[PDB]
Amino acid sequence: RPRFLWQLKFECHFFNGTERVRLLERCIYNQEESVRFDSDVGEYRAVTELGRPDAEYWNSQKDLLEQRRAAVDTYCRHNYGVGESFTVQRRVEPKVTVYPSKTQPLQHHNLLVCSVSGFYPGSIEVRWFRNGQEEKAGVVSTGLIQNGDWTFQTLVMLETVPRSGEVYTCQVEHPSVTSPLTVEWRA
Amino acid sequence: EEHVIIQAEFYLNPDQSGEFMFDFDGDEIFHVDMAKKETVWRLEEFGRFASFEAQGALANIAVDKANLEIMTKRSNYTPITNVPPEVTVLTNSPVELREPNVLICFIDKFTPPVVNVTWLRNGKPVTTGVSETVFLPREDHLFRKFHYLPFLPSTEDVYDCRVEHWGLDEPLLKHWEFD
């Protein structure tokens, strides 16, 4: 049996705190967005012809347009306001682990893995150093991975051929910490 | 841009399944249990800072149901094209034997929002401690969802996340085992 799906979305986009806010109301039939309200536009617009009726109609209703035009304060800035403590300011520190991906004995190419996990928010800088010098090449990163539970994780690998007494360091910079986290690995 | 809060709802037929939720930067703030008619906060500690009256969501779902009926017909009844999910299984952190960890089954880029997920332990289904999220919106208008399995790392067993979706020829089993 065929399925038909309807979605409605109200997106509050915040720039420089609530300095700049933009609200978007989108109506999507199945996977096609048909009509949307963009605070920066001030009125509805049909995204696809299936939404033209709605755009024509809702723009006619003028109480509805005034209501929307004001949602930027009544809805957007209000909810940011209410949520700010537990969302905008959430701050979980990353667990940093360093380990070679394989146990293939010295002087053989190996991938050194810097595992950074359980952090919030998303932004973070993970750097690799060899004997104090920063290593920019041969870095393979999984990118940021959202775990769906208000925490992130990322794995940043360094392609190495460890020689004896080489000291490798993963350095992590994240808003939840004053000074960069570092973990060393001794070949 | 700094942040984005997203109020997302959907109504699906013929399933007659609906959803109401909030999203902050990719993460679910809360969703309304339509059946129990109650607000469920993603992190318990969120409900100590804000309040949401569930009956409103329920009203919203009704307009959604209605509007869907109007649109389906308006579209000359064009049904939704299934888009099977991408599935990934991972853990919360680096596995260490005899160190409680969590297996995350990440289901992404699918539509419609209906999926059946089973955790199998040495081929037998596992339910102890499992949890999952509701359907998280995506900018392309497809959905995301997570399933979780708390587990104790061992070399004695293999793991699979079994996903069933209309856009899949057969159930997709993604495997995980401790190295």
Partner: peptide, 14 residues
């Protein structure tokens, strides 16, 4: 301060 607000959708042109 408490109340998490939400918007409601308007009725489609029938």
């Amino acid at each position: 301060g408490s109340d998490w607000r939400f918007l409601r959708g308007y009725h489609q042109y029938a």
